[PDB]
Structure formats: C-alpha cells, structure tokens
Ligand binder design. Structure first.
Ligand SMILES: [Zn+2]
Lengths: 148, 117, 187, 179, 205, 349, 184
DNA sequence: GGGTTGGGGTTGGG
C-alpha cells in the first residue's frame, strides 16, 4: 500500500530478473514485491559512467556490498545544464581530488523502462549504512506481516 | 553488467572465512604509523588492528577519518585493498549497532535478502 | 527519555481521536514541498494585538495597546512532513519558519526572516524565495508534531502543527530502529 | 439600434435625441473639470502645453470618444459584407450629427465662449467636408461596374440620394429633429 | 481606416499581440518540427483536432523541438504518468493550467478537486498527440506553450500553459477621507438637541 | 463636528422620483412620519412579533433584516435590507450570501422560463428579438392597423400566495433534484478595433476578464455542460476563451425548499428596535424575488391565456404579449382579442 | 470535496427507492396463488428487479474493486458502501482516465435485486451504468459502513453509531419481514 | 498561533 520502499542493489536485481522471467502479471508498469511500488531508497557509492553519443541521458552506477545497478540521469531540454544536486556532487568530486563517496539516493523504477534517479545527497557519516540496513530489514518485516 | 558479492564481516570471522572477496569497515590507525595503512575495529578499548598492504597511509586526504575496504583477506590482519572510499566523520562511529546489523544479516531469516539462497 | 512514533501511528490515533483531543509525538522525518500559493505572512502587534486595524499607506494602529505601532510581520508556511511510512500536511509557525530560513541562509537574522520575505515579495523578487524554499527540500530533521481534532465552520477536521524542529543525528534513530526490529523478531 | 427594427431615418432620429440627452447629461463633468487648472500638473502640462491645457484635454477627449462611438455605431448597424465606402459615409454622417449637436449646445456657454469653440467648429466643418467628399467619390466608385450591390446597399444608396447629401444637410434636419 | 468586424479568428487576434512571438496551429507546428509528414495519413477527427487546436509561445522554439534522429518515438508510459512528470518538473511555479485542482508532494502529485478540463487533457486525441510527440518532448511542450482547443463555434478552452489571468495585473502620502456617508439615515432622537452622548463633547463632563 | 451634528439633529435622505437629489428633515417630523408609516403597514402586511413563536433553529440559523422608508408624493415606499450578519450564534454571512446558490439555480430556471410556460421577458435583447419577430410578421401581413393595451400589477411581491408558490415549486419538474456548481473565468473581446501593423500590446487591450458561476444537472443533457464547463450566448462570431476553476459546490432541491419555506413563513425584520414579520408574499430585495415573482405570475397567466395559444392559426391574427415583472404590454390586430385579454386578466385577478 | 458528497444525501434516495421497490412488489404479487408462491420459492435465483428512477443519481469515489466476484466499493465522507455491478461492460462503458481506483464517478442508474437464500431473503444492489468524471487521489477514512453483499447481517452492522444507518437498517428489516410474510 | 472575498463605483429599467 506504500509506493516508496527501501531496498538495495541485490533486491533490485532479483526483482528485475523475476519480472522479466515471469511477465504474466497485471498490465501495469508497477512492480510486485509484497505489493506495488514505484519509489525506492538506497545508500551506495555513485560514479559517473561515460556513455557514447547519448547527450540527453546520463548513465550512472551504484555499486554496493550486494551488487551494482545502472541508473539514468535526465537534464533540462530548453538549456543544457545539470541538476543542482548533481552539480554539487561534481564540484565536491573535483574539490576532494576525484574521490567517490556514498550517497543517499531516491530513485524511481518502472518495468519495461530504465531506472530513473531523481535526487541524492552525499553522506559523510558511516552510521547511515547501519541505519539504512536496519530500516530495510524493518520495512521488509512490516510489509511481510502486513501482507498476511 | 557484472556482479560481485561483498559481505560485511566483523573481526572474529576472517579467521573462519580464511579468505573470501569481502568488505570490511573501520577507523584509521595513526598511533602505530606503519608503512602501509592500518585500521582498527571497535571503540579501541580492545586491540583489533588490521593492515592493508596495497594502499599507503599518507596518500589519503588528511581530513579523512573513517574508511572501508572491499577486498579479499590474504592472511590474518592482512587484507588486500582493491576499492577504497573515504569518510570524514565529526561523530564517533558506533560499533555495537553495526555488529547487531551484521549478525541479523547473517541470520537465516534475513539472509535471503542480503545474499542469494 | 523520549519515545518516537511513526506517521502511520499518528494518523491512526488522530483518526480514532474524538473532537477536541490533542496529543504530541516525536518523529524522524524530512520536510518537503513548502506551499506558497496562499499569503505567506500576517501582521501582529508587539503587545499581542488580536485585531489589527488596516489602513492605507502602510499605516497601522493596534487595539490591544492603543499606540502608533510599527507593523510586525509573522511568517506563515505550509509544507508536508514524511517518514519512510507516510506523509502528512503540517503547519509551520513564525519561530520554526525563521529557524529554517536562518539555517538555510545564515545571512538573514532570525526575526529578520519575515521582513526579508515581505521585502522580496513586495519588491517583486520571487525567484530568490522560490529557490530558497526549494533548497529546503528533503531536509531531514526531528519533528514534534501535535494534532488537533477541531471543528471549523460546523465541519469536523484534523489539523497538524509542528512544535519543535531539531537537527538530526543518526545514532539514536538507528538505535531505536534496532530495538524495534529486535522486539519484532522476538515477537 | 437594431437595423431590423428601424429604418435609416429612424436610426438617425434615435441617435440625434440620444446625443442631445447625453450632452446635457455630461455638461456638469466639464463644469467640474474647469475648477482645476492642469497647468500646475506636470503630467498634463508636458502633453498639452501650459496656455490652453484644459481646452486641449477636453478637445482630445471629445474627439476620441466621438470617433469610438461612431465606429461602434457603424459596426452595430452594418454587416461585414457592406461596402467600405458606405461604412465611411455613414460614419462621417454620424460624426457630423454628434459634433453639430455638441457645438450647438456649447456655443452659448461663457467658459467655452472663446478658444474652444473655434476648434469645435473646425472639427464640425472637417466632418461635413469629409462626408461630402465621400458621397461625391462614391458615385464614381460605383460607376466603375466593379461592384454588385445587394438590397441593403441599394436601400442605402436610395436613402443618400433622396436626402441629397451631396450638397448639404438641410433636407434631413427637419426629418431627424422632429419631436 | 480600421473597422470593427463581426467575425474574427483567434489566431488572427493572437498574432496582433507583441508579447507572443510564435503563434500557429498544432498541425503546422508539427509539420515544421517534422514530427509528421503530409504523405502520412491520420483519422479525420484527429486531423480536425490538430487543425483547430491553437498553440502559442513567447519565443520561437521550433529548433528546440526539431526531430532528432538519435532515437525513435515509442510510448510505454501512461498519459497520467507523463502529465505527472510534467507537473513535477514544473516544481514551485504556481500559475499554470495543469496545476489547477492538484498539489505536488515531493515526486508525488495529488488530485483533490474537480477540474472539468481534465477530460480534454486525458482524451484519446491527447493520447494520440503524446504517441506522436514522445514523453521527453511532451513534458516540455505542456510547459513552453499555451494550448487552446476549440470546443464550440467560436469558443476555446485553455488546457495547458501559464494561466491567461496573469496578464491582467517608494510610496507617496495619501490624505484621509471625509466620512460624508455617515450623515444619511439616522433615526435616533434625544431629549436635548446637540450631539450623541458617546461623543467626546459630552464625555468630558 | 459637522458630521455628528447633522447625524444627530437631522434625518437626511432622498425622495422617490427625485433621483439622487438630497433632502433634509427635522427629527420630530421624521418621528411622526415613522409612527404614521408603522400604522399604515400594520393594518396591511406587517405584524408585531415575539421571539417565542419563531423556532430557535431558524432563529440562530438566519439573520434578520432592517427596514427603511423613502418619502413619496402622498405616501411612502418601504425598503427592507439584509446586509447585517449576526456576530453571535456563529453567523458570518447575510441572507443574500446564504441564498446565492438558490439564486444560481433560479437563474438557470430563468432560461426555460422565458418561452415555455408563459410570456416573461428579462432583458432588452429578448425584448428586441420579440419585437423584430412581431415586426416581420406585421410586414408579412401587410401593415394593418394596430391597437395596444397597457396595465400593471400593484404590489406584486406582497400579493404572492406562499402555499401556492410552495406547491408550484414542489410540483415543478423544471427543477431537478441535484445540481453541481462550477466556477470558471471568461475572456471576451471588447469593442476595440484591431490595430494594423505602439509596441506594448497585451491581452487587456483586446479582452475583458469576467468571473462566472454556473449550476448544472447530472442528466445527459443536450448542452453537455459536463464536457465544457460553461454556457455562454454570443451575438457575434468573435472568439472567446474560457478557463475552469477548482471550487465546486453541490445544492439539493430540499435545501431550496427549506430556504423558501423559511423566507415565506418566518421572515423577521426590525425597525426602531421593534421586530416585525411579513404576513403575505415574499420580501422584495432578495436576489431570488424577481425570478420567483415572474414564475408565480407566469403560472396564472398561462392558466388564463389559453386562447392566445391557438388564436394565431384559428383566424390568423397577429398579436404580441410580454410581461416584465409586474408590467404588462399587449399589441394585437384584433380589438376583440384585446378585450378578451382584458376580461381574462380581470377574471384571473 | 467531502462536503459536496455529503450534500448528496444518498440515504434519502436509497430509502425512497427501497420503498418504491417494496410497494411495486406488493402490488404486482397480490395474486397469492399458493402453488405459484411455492414454486417461485427456490434457492439462489432472482425474483424481482426494480430499476431506480432518474432522480436518484449520486456520485462517489471508487476505493477498491474486485473482478472475480464483481464487487465494487464506493465511499463518500463518513460512509463507504460495498455494492456489485452487472458485468465488465459497465467498467468498459465508463471511460476511466487511468484506473477505476481513486476516480470520481457518477451512477447513471442502478437497480435493487432481491434473492432468496438459506430460507431468507437478501437484497442486492447492482450498478448498471457508470461514468467517470475526474480522478480523486484522496483517501477518505470512513469510520462507518454498510454492506449490501451480506444482507441483514451486513447492513445492521455498526448501526448504533449512525442514526441514518439505524433508520435504513430498520427499513430493511421491515421490508424483509413484509416480503417473508407475503411469500410464506 | 490562521482561516470565502472585500471591495470600487454608482447608469437605466424593474
Ligand atoms: Zn498593540
């Protein structure tokens, strides 16, 4: 009954693989993991990926202790610039001598489409990792017990 | 386009693993000053120090305070350094909560989400 | 010590509550989507002037004090607070609104926030205000939320107001999540 | 002012009487206006000089209002298919009627007795001249056989020729001023 | 000279406004952007809707919406999803037709009031329009243009863009005003002629 | 000094047929006039009232009105106003603000009230089109002689039967059970010609902005208001633009029935701190009074004007009848038809 | 929005239509032939169908639907209803904007359905024509509800908390008593 | 601790 759920790269991978393997579901873009959802919360390091001949779409990468996911970054059309939250990451990366950092990212995924990443914030505290893990486990338990 | 599985383990179980492509996280050591980077586990009340040989102590940013390493342990206290990112931390890192998180993760009921099978 | 409740718990208790009931809660959440369609501020006197007599040419005169008063601007903001569970609309008053304004921009002084907003609006500089409000999006905090089951215009309604806003710190929130999950596992 | 109800003479009489009422209605407004000298206001002095600011302001207002009213009246009376020459001739006739009424009313007032009356008389003379010139040119325009007239255009031509607008206006005045 | 006319065209009237630089119907805009071609065939109703629909913009953006050979146009999202994406992209701006009766909460949009114009927005004609256009171009077309659709013999209904009412909008001393209106309709009567007992003339003693 | 003295020592007002001209009267004279006017009104239509009789529900739900008297040649002219709102009992609106929903509903009713169930007119456009049709028919006939009759009703508002009005409202099928209210903005061309191409030209130079409300039924009506959201009449081909709004409202026939019953029965007005209550008819000055009066008298006139429905083909006689509020005008070709109309109207009265 | 639906007064229309159905059934089955009364008393089949008149149309927000059992949930303000619909054709006729859920709809017509089951009578409400107007993604938390798919047990539930629900339940029970008295 | 939308303007019929 909630459209936003927190999960990590491995959960993304298994959900996508299961949806592709078994497409006999409802004719709607919503995924199915103890319900329908469109938003996800994940904390992992981000790194730019250099695409070719692909100006409108910017390809990302989120490697984590469980796996890696590919996301697409969209930019404005009337003028060619970057969203402020990603310009902040770019300037931080150039300032800190090209060192990647973990980020707290919120991203939207739909089946038969790429995974769009809307916003993220750079995290500098390590306790956020444990916070995200515990929140993930608690939310999964809540969803499982609310299904029944 | 590829998948690498990087489990998070506390101090006690690298001996039981005896070498897997894993990840570890800890605070940087500076009281010892070895040639290579050395990090410690826990709140430093008990001595649990591990050294990584691939990565040099000084090449990191001076403001860096906390780090994690994703890589295979070669021998006890010696862990290979393949991927390394930095965290400057103004707040001391709690270790017991991370411990319980790792245990729960190792629990069979939540192990299905954290790792395959 | 304090006890923290979730947005869904607050919603259920507010619904089950009878008219005229109040209760307070403490929640880990993030502010989002500040609304500015309605009037952003109102005028009150220093002596708590209940009625402010409007005149022309920026003239003001309180009734609770009966002196020629310089108008005092009080900032009124509407936004939405939301945890991982649910979302609700909240009322933000002068003190909290000024606190967030000074936090996002240290240049503007605490009680100077309302005057700064009024000056920008009257001069016709709304892009700056919009950008400042947008910079506050997904700002994690610790919220003290009170709900009131009150009747307005012979219509029952529930109103949510934020009382305290504090800087967030992950340690005790993670501890609370850990004990909650351990309790759930035990049960 | 529906043309389906009145004829051309009826419309002219209606406009005549309505204008005669409205000028007396509006007279107190310029009486009040003359109580203020605009030469002390820069906003109006820079635009109308300093000698006859009130007279220039009143003349401009009257001229533009009359022109707008005449345009609206022509739009209401005629359809888009009617000839532009007919439209212009009727607009000139209406403008002359309005200006003649205004001049006749205001020619006796003491405050307007001097500078303004000459300008209003000039405007009325210009309108009469333009109406006569348009009426004279319309005959040559229609003689080219380039246009086919409908029943309404034929009625308008017959009306204009019967009232002999080519020479003067003395024929139509008894018909429109009857009370 | 200039004459008033009983019959006028919305496009002709709009071309007389200096603020608007580009005014054209949807069909010619699509032909200029090469999203469609004359050789292509469409339903008669869709063609009539394209011809009657009138769009306008403050600047010339034909080049910005020029057809791009990098990637074709196929649609997989819903029209509601595209509209929600456009509304989210609109952000804090609060004067647009599409935002009427709805509110934005983060990356979620909520509908809470009745808007009779949403039928035109979600109609099959707009569905086919989106199919022709594409998501990325539609989301910005709904913002960069003022959309007017004919629904009567001469009436038009605006369904997107900045609301038209937005175009219809150091101090100096202002003296007080004489309260002359207070004189009228006073039915009170008192034993001694003078003024009311509440006045300061009588309150002093 | 000046305003308080004039207020205390004089009653200042305007007469009936003197327009906006101002007149002054000494206070005792106005006291005598007020006493005499009270005496006149009590015998005819007003009665002194006690708050015990009026139910507390309506007492706390509806505000009361004020009465004002304008001098007339040999008589007066009462005017009752309903501007006040009760600060106590949680009242924030006056009677007109309460009843403007029913006013919208009855304004919708006015459209089919024009031609269906009587001879009622409301605006110069309707008057002009009726006149044009009659003129065309007269031209077709061949310009025969014409005769006219003019008469009007005295105090139409006070001569309205409350029970008859309520019965007509209940049994009238032109009023549906439920209605929905829509708000929208209309942009319409002004009377300014188009400039031909000094640089600052905007929409207000060519268009006028108006706020409009409308009430529509849930039936699958021909006008299909659900598809558009507006219902406008244009006398030209010039275009216009409409944008909708997000503030809808619902009104039920039962609410209108309750409002009509309350205003018919428990109408309370005050004068010199003395309360009064109407005994017959509806109070003038309410936004629905004109429409209600037109409908009520249209019922009786359609009852008693059966012959006119068939006369124009029975013997081919051209005849025209209009009624604006309480004023009647009838032009025909048959003196017999005119006499019959006079007789039938007298019988109906 | 809630006020707009609360002003509809759905209970009035429901009571009037129920009274009309009861009266029509009473007058149309005054034959009182004993063998005919016996033979139309059979398990799980409809016996009468009364379509509502044009005056009693109302609008509600769809909260949930179920295609397998043809169960549709309606709500407005404080009260939510669970009714059935004729078939999928009703859904296809209603040009839904995106989805049946969270869409404001107007009921063009519906009909009361009477059924005999388990030695008693159950009254069903079936929606016949549907029309969507606009999408309302606002969750209304209805404290109170009545069920038309469970009969007297599904209607008399929670009656003590609503006066209108109490009156409608009393009318329903009286209608059931009259029906059983006439038929048996 | 807040809260329809308060005006501005005044002609011609009823
Ligand atoms: Zn004060």
């Amino acid at each position: 009954p909630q459209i936003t759920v927190p999960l990590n790269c491995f959960m993304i991978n298994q959900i996508v693989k299961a949806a592709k393997e078994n497409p006999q579901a409802h004719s709607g873009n919503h995924y199915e993991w103890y319900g329908a959802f469109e938003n996800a919360i994940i904390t992992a390091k981000f790194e730019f990926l250099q695409s070719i001949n692909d100006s409108p779409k910017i390809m990302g990468k989120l490697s984590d202790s469980t796996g890696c996911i590919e996301v697409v970054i969209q930019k404005s059309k009337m003028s060619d610039e970057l969203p402020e939250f990603v310009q902040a990451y770019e300037i931080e990366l150039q300032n800190n001598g090209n060192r990647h950092k973990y980020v707290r990212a919120m991203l939207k995924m739909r089946k038969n489409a790429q995974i769009q990443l809307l916003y993220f914030s750079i995290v500098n505290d390590a306790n956020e990792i444990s916070r995200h893990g515990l929140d993930l486990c608690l939310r999964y338990l809540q969803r499982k017990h609310g299904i029944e | 386009q590829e998948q690498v599985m990087y489990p998070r383990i506390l101090f006690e179980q690298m001996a039981q693993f005896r070498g897997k492509k894993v990840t570890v996280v800890g605070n940087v050591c500076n009281e010892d000053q070895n040639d290579s980077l050395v990090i410690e586990f826990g709140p430093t009340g008990l001595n649990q120090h591990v050294v990584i040989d691939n990565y040099r102590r000084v090449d990191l940013n001076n403001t860096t305070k906390f780090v994690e390493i994703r890589g295979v342990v070669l021998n006890q206290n010696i862990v290979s350094c393949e991927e390394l990112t930095e965290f400057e931390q103004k707040d001391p890192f709690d270790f017991d909560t991370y411990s319980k998180l790792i245990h729960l993760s190792q629990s069979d009921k939540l192990s299905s989400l954290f790792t395959d099978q | 010590q304090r006890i923290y409740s979730s947005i869904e718990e607050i919603i259920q208790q507010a619904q089950a509550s009878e008219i005229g009931q109040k209760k307070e809660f403490y929640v880990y959440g993030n502010l989002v989507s500040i609304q500015m369609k309605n009037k952003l501020y109102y005028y009150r006197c220093t002596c708590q002037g209940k009625s402010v007599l409007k005149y022309h040419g920026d003239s003001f005169f309180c009734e609770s004090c009966q002196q020629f008063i310089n108008p005092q601007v009080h900032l009124m903001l509407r936004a939405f607070v939301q945890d991982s569970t649910g979302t609700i609309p909240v009322m933000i008053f002068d003190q909290q609104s000024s606190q967030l304004i000074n936090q996002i921009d240290p240049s503007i002084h605490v009680q100077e926030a309302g005057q700064y907003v009024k000056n920008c609006i009257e001069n016709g500089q709304e892009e700056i205000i919009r950008q400042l409000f947008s910079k506050l999006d997904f700002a994690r905090f610790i919220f003290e939320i009170q709900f009131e089951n009150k009747e307005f215009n012979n219509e029952q309604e529930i109103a949510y107001k934020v009382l305290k806003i504090e800087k967030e710190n992950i340690k005790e929130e993670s501890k609370y999540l850990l004990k909650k999950l351990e309790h759930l596992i035990n049960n | 002012f529906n043309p389906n109800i009145n004829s051309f003479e009826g419309l002219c009489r209606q406009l005549y009487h309505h204008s005669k009422a409205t000028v007396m209605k509006f007279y107190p407004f310029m009486t009040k206006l003359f109580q203020i000298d605009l030469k002390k206001s820069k906003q109006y002095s820079v635009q109308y000089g300093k000698e006859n600011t009130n007279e220039n302001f009143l003349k401009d207002i009257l001229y533009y209002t009359v022109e707008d009213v005449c345009k609206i009246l022509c739009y209401l009376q005629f359809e888009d298919e009617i000839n532009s020459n007919i439209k212009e001739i009727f607009k000139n006739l209406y403008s002359w009627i309005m200006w003649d009424i205004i001049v006749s009313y205001l020619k006796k007032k003491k405050q307007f007795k001097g500078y303004l009356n000459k300008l209003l008389q000039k405007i009325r003379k210009s309108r009469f001249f333009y109406l006569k010139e348009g009426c004279k040119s319309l005959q040559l325009i229609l003689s080219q056989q380039k246009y086919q007239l409908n029943k309404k255009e034929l009625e308008a031509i017959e009306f204009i020729d019967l009232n002999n607008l080519i020479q003067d206006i003395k024929t139509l005045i008894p018909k429109i001023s009857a009370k | 000279k200039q004459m008033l006319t009983r019959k006028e065209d919305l496009l002709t009237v709009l071309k007389q406004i200096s603020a608007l630089k580009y005014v054209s119907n949807l069909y010619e805009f699509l032909l200029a952007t090469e999203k469609i071609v004359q050789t292509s065939e469409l339903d008669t109703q869709f063609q009539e809707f394209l011809t009657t629909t009138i769009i306008a913009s403050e600047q010339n953006l034909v080049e910005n919406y020029k057809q791009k050979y990098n990637q074709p146009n196929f649609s997989q999202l819903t029209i509601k999803q595209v509209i929600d994406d456009s509304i989210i992209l609109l952000g804090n701006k609060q004067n647009y037709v599409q935002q009427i009766g709805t509110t934005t909460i983060g990356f979620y949009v909520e509908y809470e009031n009745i808007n009779l114009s949403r039928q035109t927005l979600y109609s099959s004609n707009f569905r086919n329009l989106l199919n022709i256009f594409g998501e990325e171009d539609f989301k910005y077309f709904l913002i960069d243009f003022l959309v007017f659709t004919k629904v009567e013999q001469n009436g038009y209904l605006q369904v997107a863009g900045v609301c038209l009412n937005q175009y219809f909008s150091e101090n100096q001393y202002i003296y007080p005003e004489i309260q002359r209106s207070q004189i009228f309709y006073c039915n009170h009567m008192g034993r001694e002629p003078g003024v009311f007992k509440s006045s300061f003339f009588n309150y002093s003693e | 000094i000046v305003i308080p003295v004039l207020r205390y020592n004089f009653y200042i007002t305007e007469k009936h047929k003197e327009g906006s001209q101002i007149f002054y009267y000494r206070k005792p004279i106005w006291k005598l006039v007020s006493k005499l006017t009270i005496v006149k009104l009590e015998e005819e239509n007003l009665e002194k009232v006690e708050e015990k009789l009026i139910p507390e529900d309506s007492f706390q739900k509806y505000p009361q009105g004020k009465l004002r008297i304008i001098p007339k040649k040999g008589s007066f002219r009462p005017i009752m106003t309903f501007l006040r709102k009760d600060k106590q009992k949680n009242i924030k609106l006056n009677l007109n603000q309460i009843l403007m929903d029913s006013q919208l509903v009855f304004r919708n009713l006015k459209d089919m009230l024009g031609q269906k169930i009587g001879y009622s007119v409301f605006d110069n456009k309707q008057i002009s089109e009726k006149f044009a049709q009659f003129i065309e028919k007269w031209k077709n006939k061949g310009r025969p002689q014409l005769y006219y009759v003019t008469l009007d009703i005295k105090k139409c508002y006070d001569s309205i039967d409350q029970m008859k009005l309520l019965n007509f409202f209940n049994q009238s099928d032109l009023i549906q059970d439920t209605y929905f209210i829509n708000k929208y903005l209309l942009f319409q061309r002004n009377k300014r010609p188009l400039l031909q191409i000094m640089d600052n030209i905007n929409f207000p130079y060519y268009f006028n902005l108006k706020e409009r409300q409308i009430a529509y039924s849930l039936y699958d009506d021909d006008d299909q208001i659900l598809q558009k959201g507006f219902k406008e009449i244009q006398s030209d081909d010039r275009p216009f633009i409409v944008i909708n709004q997000d503030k809808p409202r619902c009104i039920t026939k039962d609410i209108i029935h309750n409002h009509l019953k309350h205003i018919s029965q428990y109408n309370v007005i005050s004068f010199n701190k003395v309360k009064f209550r109407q005994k017959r008819g509806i109070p003038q000055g309410l936004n629905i009074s004109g429409v209600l009066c037109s409908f009520y008298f249209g019922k009786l006139e359609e009852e008693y004007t059966q012959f006119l429905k068939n006369a124009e083909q029975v013997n081919g006689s051209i005849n025209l009848l209009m009624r604006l509020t309480d004023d009647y005008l009838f032009i025909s070709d048959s003196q017999q038809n005119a006499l019959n109309l006079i007789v039938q109207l007298q019988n109906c009265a | 929005m809630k006020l707009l639906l609360q002003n509809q007064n759905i209970f009035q229309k429901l009571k009037n239509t129920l009274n009309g159905c009861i009266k029509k059934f009473y007058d149309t089955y005054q034959d009182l032939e004993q063998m005919q009364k016996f033979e139309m008393i059979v398990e799980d089949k409809l016996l009468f169908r009364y379509s509502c008149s044009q005056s009693e149309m109302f609008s509600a927000q769809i909260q949930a639907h179920y295609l397998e059992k043809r169960v549709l949930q309606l709500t407005d303000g404080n009260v939510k209803y669970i009714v059935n619909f004729r078939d999928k054709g009703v859904l296809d006729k209603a040009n839904f904007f995106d989805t049946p859920n969270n869409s404001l709809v107007i009921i063009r017509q519906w009909s009361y359905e009477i059924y005999y089951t388990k030695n008693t009578f159950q009254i069903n409400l079936v929606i016949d024509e549907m029309r969507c107007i606009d999408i309302i993604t606002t969750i209304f938390y209805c404290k109170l509800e009545l069920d038309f798919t469970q009969g007297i047990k599904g209607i008399s539930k929670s009656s003590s908390f609503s006066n209108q629900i109490y009156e409608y339940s009393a009318q329903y029970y009286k209608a059931i008593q009259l029906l059983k008295k006439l038929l048996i």
